[PDB]
Structure 1
């Protein structure tokens, strides 16, 4: 939407921060049928199935060739990716979707608000304005909360978790083996003007509802859009060394919400107390 000229914007993080987070890592398996093909801190998760694959998120546009190489290094084909699902429509997660869509022929799945922002190539961000644009994408299938997709025994379900952005979306995956997985979107509000933000007036009520939404979900494997939030690098090394169940963490999601809640309320409390 058009931004209110009376509403101050947050300062975007420097692109150098995303570049550091985009440092490549060797792709690896989180669990049978579940592959990590992202970077050190920008998550991208491939779900493989006998009827095609699902990719969650795509990193920076500059990372697109590396993600394709990671997918190919594991032995899979871009042409077999049927869906690309997006958590939130900023360059850190959607920057490479345009190129990965072109390379795969997949259909992109995203919430309406993420679809609108992706069509704008990241511009008119309620918090960042036009600070960090990326290649525009036309979402093929707009997701609504609770909607489900089925592919070769895998179920992909949208869990709306607004706050980081109005369209921020978490994803619940049910594998054919019965194991469950949540890919949690960010709950962070770095540099955000939180209180009565004219570009996003329901922000704090939304993010508090997103806490409870994720807290009401119980799964086996906790993943997030940012590696640091679920111990990606530590778990990756442990599993390579022999810890098959390194990413099994039934309390992981609840722990993430508790941490995110405490961090958010601490920031909001400081802004509320501003003289």
Structure 2
């Protein structure tokens, strides 16, 4: 007799789980995640913001990096998300338990986060994580301000219904730097055409390419740094090769058009 298969854990490349020290992006903005997963800390005179947390098991690493920056659990006021997949929202529940952080997300991201990534439109229960509740629901173009840093939400539905780009203005060398944290624009294994769970998927992706192309974007960062040609392990030249938002969107659309043709052929 043959039993049912064992549950399969969501395993990833080692680099995605490789701790790194804080890497400064601009005067108030640091990468504090791993070599291959972004987790941005924005530190202000009136508290700190975390954009994404990476994988579930990264909670303690993030807190150690925060502490290295001078940010205590109480100082963390807000968590924002690119999208609510396990490799970006993974430790959110734990972070909420262990800090003062509240979560702000759009309705789509909130509902997916509340399900722990279960019943994903494309992955089903393949990639789940501890569920968390959002404290505040944000609308497209809504701004959230923490210690003078103004974060604007730009909905860019496709990778997930709730995919969001977050933009804000920091400084570097006395000059403004408009940072754009643009979400994933991939569709990994997705049925793109005539998908009953996402009937307007293709139109949403196309609108999202347009949104990304137009973002205020002196510096682009992405949840997977490789997608925007960042190399977090490259120290002083980590961001040297970074794509513009325009180039990121163009590359994403070209890949998408190729995937559509492959889907039609398959």
155-164 vs 249-258, which deviates more? 249-258
Q: Hey, what's the Cα distance between the residues in 2 that align with 1:237 and 1:110?
A: 32
Q: How many residues align structurally?
A: 256
Aligned: 1:67 with 2:62 = yes
Question: For 1:103-182, what aligned pairs fall within 5 Å after superposition?
Answer: 103-175=98-170, 178-182=176-180
Deviations 1:86-122 (A, max 9, x none): 1111101101011111222111011101100111111
Match of 2:209 in 1: 211
Question: For 1:263-274, what aligned pairs fall within 5 Å after superposition?
Answer: 263-274=255-266
SS at match of 1:175: strand
Q: Hey, what's the Cα distance between the residues in 2 that align with 1:255 and 1:41?
A: 20
Match of 1:21 in 2: 16
The TM-score normalised by the length of structure 1 is 0.87
CA gap of 1:249–1:220, structure 2 versus 1, over 3 A, is farther
> Once the 2 structures are TM-superposed, how far is the Cα of residue 238 of structure 1 from its aligned partner?
4.4
87-96 vs 224-233, which deviates more? 224-233
Match of 2:193 in 1: 195
Q: Hey, what's the Cα distance between the residues in 2 that align with 1:22 and 1:173?
A: 27
174-183 vs 25-34, which deviates more? 174-183
The alignment's C-alpha RMSD in Å is 2.0
Q: Hey, what's the Cα distance between the residues in 1 that align with 2:14 and 2:201?
A: 28
Work out whether residues 220 and 248 of structure 1, in 8 Å CA contact, stay in contact via their aligned partners in 2.
no
> Once the 2 structures are TM-superposed, how far is the Cα of residue 133 of structure 1 from its aligned partner?
1.3
CA gap of 1:18–1:95, structure 2 versus 1, over 3 A, is farther
CA gap of 1:217–1:249, structure 2 versus 1, over 3 A, is farther
75-84 vs 198-207, which deviates more? 75-84
Mark the runs of 5 or more structure 1 residues left unpaired by the alignment. 1-12
Aligned: 1:79 with 2:71 = no
Match of 2:234 in 1: 237
1:90 aligns with one of 85, 94, 110: 85
Deviations 1:106-155 (A, max 9, x none): 11011101100111111110001111111111100111110001111100
157-166 vs 65-74, which deviates more? 65-74
SS at match of 1:46: strand
Work out whether residues 188 and 264 of structure 1, in 8 Å CA contact, stay in contact via their aligned partners in 2.
yes
Work out whether residues 48 and 71 of structure 2, in 8 Å CA contact, stay in contact via their aligned partners in 1.
no
Q: Hey, what's the Cα distance between the residues in 1 that align with 2:176 and 2:25?
A: 15
2:251 aligns with one of 243, 259, 263: 259
SS at match of 2:125: coil
Q: Hey, what's the Cα distance between the residues in 1 that align with 2:247 and 2:116?
A: 33
